Coordinates of C-alpha atoms in Angstrom, one line a residue:
Chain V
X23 CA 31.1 -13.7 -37.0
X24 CA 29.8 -11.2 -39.8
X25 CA 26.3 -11.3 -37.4
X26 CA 24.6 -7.7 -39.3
X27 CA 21.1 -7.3 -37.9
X28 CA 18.4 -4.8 -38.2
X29 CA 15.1 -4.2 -36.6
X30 CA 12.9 -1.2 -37.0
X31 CA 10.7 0.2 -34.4
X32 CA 7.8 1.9 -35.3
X33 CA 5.9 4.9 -33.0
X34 CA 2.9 3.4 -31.4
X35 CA 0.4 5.2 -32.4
X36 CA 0.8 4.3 -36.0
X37 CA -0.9 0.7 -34.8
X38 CA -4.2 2.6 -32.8
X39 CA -5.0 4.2 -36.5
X40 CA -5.9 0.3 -37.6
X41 CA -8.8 0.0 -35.0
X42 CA -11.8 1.4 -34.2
X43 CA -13.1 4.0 -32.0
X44 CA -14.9 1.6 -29.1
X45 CA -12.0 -1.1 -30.0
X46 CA -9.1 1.9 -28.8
X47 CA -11.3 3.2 -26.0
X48 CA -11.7 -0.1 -24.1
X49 CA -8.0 -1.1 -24.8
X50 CA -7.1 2.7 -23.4
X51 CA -9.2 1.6 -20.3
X52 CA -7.5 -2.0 -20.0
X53 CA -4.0 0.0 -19.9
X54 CA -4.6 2.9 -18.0
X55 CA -6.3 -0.2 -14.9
X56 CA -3.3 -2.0 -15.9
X57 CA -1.0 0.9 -15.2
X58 CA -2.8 1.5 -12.2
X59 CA -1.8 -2.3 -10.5
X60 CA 1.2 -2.3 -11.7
X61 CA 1.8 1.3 -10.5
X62 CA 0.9 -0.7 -7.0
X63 CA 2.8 -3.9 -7.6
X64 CA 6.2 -1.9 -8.8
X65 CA 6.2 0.2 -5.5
X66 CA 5.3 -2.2 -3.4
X67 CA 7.9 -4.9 -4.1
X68 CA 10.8 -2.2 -4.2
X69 CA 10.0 -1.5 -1.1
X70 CA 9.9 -5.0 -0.2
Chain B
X9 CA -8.7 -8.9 27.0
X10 CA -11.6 -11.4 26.7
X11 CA -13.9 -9.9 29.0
X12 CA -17.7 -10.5 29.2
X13 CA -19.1 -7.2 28.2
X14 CA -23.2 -7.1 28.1
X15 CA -24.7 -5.2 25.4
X16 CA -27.9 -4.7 23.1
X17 CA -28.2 -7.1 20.3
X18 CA -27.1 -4.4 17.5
X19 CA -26.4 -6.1 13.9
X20 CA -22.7 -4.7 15.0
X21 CA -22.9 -6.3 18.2
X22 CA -24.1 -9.5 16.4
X23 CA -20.8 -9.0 14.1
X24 CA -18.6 -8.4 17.2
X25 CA -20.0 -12.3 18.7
X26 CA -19.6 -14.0 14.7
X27 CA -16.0 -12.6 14.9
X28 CA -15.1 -13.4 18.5
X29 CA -16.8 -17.2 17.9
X30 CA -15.0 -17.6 14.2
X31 CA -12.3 -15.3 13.8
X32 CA -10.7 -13.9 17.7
X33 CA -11.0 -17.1 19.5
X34 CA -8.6 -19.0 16.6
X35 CA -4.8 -19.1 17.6
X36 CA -2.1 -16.5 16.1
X37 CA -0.6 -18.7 13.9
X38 CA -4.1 -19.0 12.0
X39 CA -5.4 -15.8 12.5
X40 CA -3.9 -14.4 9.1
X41 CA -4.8 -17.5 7.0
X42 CA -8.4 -17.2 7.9
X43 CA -8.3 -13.4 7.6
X44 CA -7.0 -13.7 4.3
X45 CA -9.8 -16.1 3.7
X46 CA -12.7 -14.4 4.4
X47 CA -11.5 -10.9 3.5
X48 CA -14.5 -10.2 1.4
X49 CA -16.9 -11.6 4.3
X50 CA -15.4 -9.7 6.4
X51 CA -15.7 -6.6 4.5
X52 CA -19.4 -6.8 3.3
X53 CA -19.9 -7.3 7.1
X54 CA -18.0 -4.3 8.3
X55 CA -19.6 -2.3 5.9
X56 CA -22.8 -3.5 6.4
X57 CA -23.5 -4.1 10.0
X58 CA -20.7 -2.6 11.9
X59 CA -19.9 1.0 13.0
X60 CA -16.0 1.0 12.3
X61 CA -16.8 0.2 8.1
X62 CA -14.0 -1.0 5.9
X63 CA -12.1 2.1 4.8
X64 CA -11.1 1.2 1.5
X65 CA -14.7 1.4 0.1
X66 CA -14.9 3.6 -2.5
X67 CA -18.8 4.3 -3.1
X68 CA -19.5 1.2 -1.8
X69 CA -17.2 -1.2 -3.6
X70 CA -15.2 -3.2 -1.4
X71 CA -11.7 -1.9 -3.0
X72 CA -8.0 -2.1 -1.0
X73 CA -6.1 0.6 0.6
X74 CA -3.6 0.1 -2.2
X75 CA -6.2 -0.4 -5.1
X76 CA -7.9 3.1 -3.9
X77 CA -6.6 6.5 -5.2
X78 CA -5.1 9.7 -3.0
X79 CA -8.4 11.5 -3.9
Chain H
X24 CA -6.3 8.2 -10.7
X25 CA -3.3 6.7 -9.3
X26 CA -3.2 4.1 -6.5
X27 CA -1.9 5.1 -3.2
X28 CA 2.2 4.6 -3.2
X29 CA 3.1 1.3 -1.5
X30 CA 5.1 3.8 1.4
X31 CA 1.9 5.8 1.4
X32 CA -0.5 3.0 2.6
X33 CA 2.5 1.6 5.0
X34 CA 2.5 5.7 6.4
X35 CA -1.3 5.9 6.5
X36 CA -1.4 2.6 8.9
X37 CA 1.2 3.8 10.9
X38 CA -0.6 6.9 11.6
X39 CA -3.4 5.1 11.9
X40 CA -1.8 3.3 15.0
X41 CA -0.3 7.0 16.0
X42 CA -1.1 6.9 19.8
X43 CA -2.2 10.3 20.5
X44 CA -4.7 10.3 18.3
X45 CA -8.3 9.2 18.7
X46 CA -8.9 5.9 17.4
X47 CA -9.9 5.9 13.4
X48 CA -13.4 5.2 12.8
X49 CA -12.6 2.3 10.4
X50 CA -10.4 -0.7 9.5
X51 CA -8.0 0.0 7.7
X52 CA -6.3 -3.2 7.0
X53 CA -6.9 -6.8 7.7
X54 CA -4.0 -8.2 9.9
X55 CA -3.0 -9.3 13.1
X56 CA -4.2 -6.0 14.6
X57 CA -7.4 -6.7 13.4
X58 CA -9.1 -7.4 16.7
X59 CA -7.4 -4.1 17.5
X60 CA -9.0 -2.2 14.8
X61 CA -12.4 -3.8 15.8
X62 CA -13.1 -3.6 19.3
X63 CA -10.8 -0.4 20.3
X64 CA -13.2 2.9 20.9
X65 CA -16.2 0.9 20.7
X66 CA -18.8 3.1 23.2
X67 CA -18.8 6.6 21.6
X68 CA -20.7 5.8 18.9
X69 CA -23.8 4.9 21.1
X70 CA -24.3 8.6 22.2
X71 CA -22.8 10.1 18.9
X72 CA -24.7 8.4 16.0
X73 CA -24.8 11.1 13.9
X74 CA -20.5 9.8 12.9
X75 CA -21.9 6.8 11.8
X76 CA -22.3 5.6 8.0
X77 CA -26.1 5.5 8.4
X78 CA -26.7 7.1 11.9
X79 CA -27.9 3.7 12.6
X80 CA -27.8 2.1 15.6
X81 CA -27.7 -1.2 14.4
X82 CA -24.2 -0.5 13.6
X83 CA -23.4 0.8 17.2
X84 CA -22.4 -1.1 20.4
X85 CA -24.3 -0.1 23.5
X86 CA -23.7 -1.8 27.0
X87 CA -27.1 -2.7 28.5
X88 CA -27.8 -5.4 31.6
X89 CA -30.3 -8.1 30.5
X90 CA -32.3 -8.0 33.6
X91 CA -32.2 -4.7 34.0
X92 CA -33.7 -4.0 30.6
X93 CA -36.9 -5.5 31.8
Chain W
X20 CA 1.3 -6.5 -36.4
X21 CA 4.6 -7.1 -33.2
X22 CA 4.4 -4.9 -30.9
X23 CA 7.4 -4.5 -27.8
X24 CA 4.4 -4.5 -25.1
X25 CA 7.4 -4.6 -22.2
X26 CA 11.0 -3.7 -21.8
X27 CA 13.3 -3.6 -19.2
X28 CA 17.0 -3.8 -18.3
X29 CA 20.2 -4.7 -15.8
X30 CA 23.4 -2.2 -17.0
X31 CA 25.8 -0.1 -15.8
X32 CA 23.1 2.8 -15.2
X33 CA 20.6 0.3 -13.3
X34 CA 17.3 -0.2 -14.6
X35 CA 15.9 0.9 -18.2
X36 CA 14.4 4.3 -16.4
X37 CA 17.8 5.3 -14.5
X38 CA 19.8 4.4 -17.8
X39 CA 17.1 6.7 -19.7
X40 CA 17.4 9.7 -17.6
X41 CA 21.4 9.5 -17.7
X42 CA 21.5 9.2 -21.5
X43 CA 19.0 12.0 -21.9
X44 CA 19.1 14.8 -19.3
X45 CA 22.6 13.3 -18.5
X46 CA 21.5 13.7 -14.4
X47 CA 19.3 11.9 -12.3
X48 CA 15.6 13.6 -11.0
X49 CA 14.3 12.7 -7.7
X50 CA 12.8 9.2 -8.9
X51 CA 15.6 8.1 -10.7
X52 CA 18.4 8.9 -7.5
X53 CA 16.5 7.5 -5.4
X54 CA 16.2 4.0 -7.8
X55 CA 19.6 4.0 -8.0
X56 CA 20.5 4.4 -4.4
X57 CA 17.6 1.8 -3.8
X58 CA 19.1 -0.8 -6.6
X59 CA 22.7 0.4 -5.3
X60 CA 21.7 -0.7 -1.8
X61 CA 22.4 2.9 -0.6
X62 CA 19.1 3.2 1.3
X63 CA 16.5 0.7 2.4
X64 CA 13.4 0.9 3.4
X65 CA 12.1 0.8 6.8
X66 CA 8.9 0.4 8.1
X67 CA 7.7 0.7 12.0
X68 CA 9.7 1.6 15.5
X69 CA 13.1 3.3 14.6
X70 CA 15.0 4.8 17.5
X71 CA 11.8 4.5 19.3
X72 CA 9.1 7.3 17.2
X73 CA 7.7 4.9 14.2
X74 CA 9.4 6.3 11.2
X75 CA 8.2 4.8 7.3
X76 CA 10.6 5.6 4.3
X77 CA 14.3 5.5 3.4
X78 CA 16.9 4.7 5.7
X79 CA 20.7 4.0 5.0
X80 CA 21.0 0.8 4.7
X81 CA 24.7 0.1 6.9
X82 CA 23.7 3.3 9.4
X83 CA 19.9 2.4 9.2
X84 CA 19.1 6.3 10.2
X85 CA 16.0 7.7 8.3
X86 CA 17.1 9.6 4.8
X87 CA 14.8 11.9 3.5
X88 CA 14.1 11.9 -0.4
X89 CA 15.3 15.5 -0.8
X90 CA 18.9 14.1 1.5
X91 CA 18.8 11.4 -1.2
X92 CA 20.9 13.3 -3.4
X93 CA 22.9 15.3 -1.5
X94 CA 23.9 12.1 0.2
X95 CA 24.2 9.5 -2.4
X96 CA 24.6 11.1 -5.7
X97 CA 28.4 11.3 -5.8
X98 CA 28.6 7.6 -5.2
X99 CA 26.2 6.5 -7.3
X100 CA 28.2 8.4 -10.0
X101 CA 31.1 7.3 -8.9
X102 CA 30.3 3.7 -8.9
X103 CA 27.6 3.5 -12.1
X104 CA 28.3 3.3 -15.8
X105 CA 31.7 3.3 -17.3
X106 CA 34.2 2.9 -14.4
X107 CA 37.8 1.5 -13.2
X108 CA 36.8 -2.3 -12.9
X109 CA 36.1 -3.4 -9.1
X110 CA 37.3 -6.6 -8.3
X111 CA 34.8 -7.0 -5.4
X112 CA 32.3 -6.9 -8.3
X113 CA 34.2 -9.6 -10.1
X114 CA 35.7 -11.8 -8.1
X115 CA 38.4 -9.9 -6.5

């Protein structure tokens, strides 16, 4: 159905260069307690 | 097994009666609601006032066995 | 800085129940083996203090007689 | 600014991770065998009294012995390759 589509992805780092230095710490906190539970909640319901 | 057992009036001792008026004594069908409950009451108790502490207590934040690290 | 594996804590409470093996000086969990956790290995802590958080024995369970105490 | 904050997906290769290490390192490590025996149904796990001595980890799931992760391979990986990715179609996956 001539359906052409294109979507670019771009590295994720390019998008930490457009905050700031307390702004990226914090958010690096958020993911790495985030990461953390769902480290914890991935395991535990394949187990389950 | 439900025995009386005499003993000195220790702050653990004092926990041991709370949980065997509030907590034991209730039925097994509503043992794990209420445990589920009163999970933090429980803890800041254990940690408090009894010798047999909540483990997961990591410098003395109530934390979970799976919300604690290997370390 | 990575949370204990889902098999790890279900490994740690089983050796935590492991028979030959003194009884842990903690609760581990909060279950139906609660009163378990609680009231097993309860005396030994009355003449050893000194494995308790504080070496308090306000934490510790000693049997004593009422009259006797007199 | 869109940003893909979460991905994940069902193929031939299992998950997003087991479909990565195929297309990559074209094998599976440790983690991603024993994903794909777990999402193949291969081994279960099993928790408590087993044959009497409490056993916690993998077992097979039909046999329901224990499996060790390092047996994990060496007992699963030739039907997991058999029966992942691009393969003669099974009609007990479609309907006979």
């Amino acid at each position: 159905g001539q359906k052409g589509g294109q979507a670019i992805v771009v590295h994720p780092d390019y998008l930490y260069g457009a905050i700031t230095e307390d702004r990226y710490n914090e958010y690096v906190a958020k993911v790495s307690a985030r990461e953390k539970s769902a480290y914890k909640f991935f395991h535990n319901g394949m187990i389950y | 097994m439900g025995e009386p057992i005499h003993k000195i009036a220790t702050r653990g001792v004092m926990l041991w009666k709370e949980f065997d008026e509030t907590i034991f004594n209730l039925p097994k069908n509503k043992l794990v609601p209420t445990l589920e409950a009163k999970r933090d009451y429980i803890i800041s108790r254990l940690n408090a006032d009894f010798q047999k502490p909540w483990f997961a207590t990591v410098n003395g934040q109530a934390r979970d066995l799976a919300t604690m690290t290997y370390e | 800085e990575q949370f204990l594996n889902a098999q790890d804590i279900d490994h740690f409470l089983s050796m935590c129940q492991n028979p030959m093996q003194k009884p842990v000086p903690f609760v581990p969990v909060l279950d139906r083996r609660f009163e378990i956790f609680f009231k097993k290995d309860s005396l030994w802590q009355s003449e050893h203090l000194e494995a308790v958080v504080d070496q308090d024995v306000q934490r510790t369970c000693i049997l004593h007689g009422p009259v006797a105490a007199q | 600014v869109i940003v893909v904050t979460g991905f994940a997906e069902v193929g031939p290769w299992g998950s997003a991770r087991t479909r990565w290490e195929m297309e990559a390192f074209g094998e599976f490590s440790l983690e991603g065998c024993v994903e794909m025996a777990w999402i193949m149904g291969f081994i279960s796990y099993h928790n408590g009294n087993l044959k009497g001595r409490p056993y916690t980890g993998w077992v097979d799931s039909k046999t329901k012995e224990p499996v060790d992760d390092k047996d994990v391979k060496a007992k699963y990986e030739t039907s997991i390759l058999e029966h992942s990715g691009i393969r003669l179609i099974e009609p007990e996956l479609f309907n006979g």
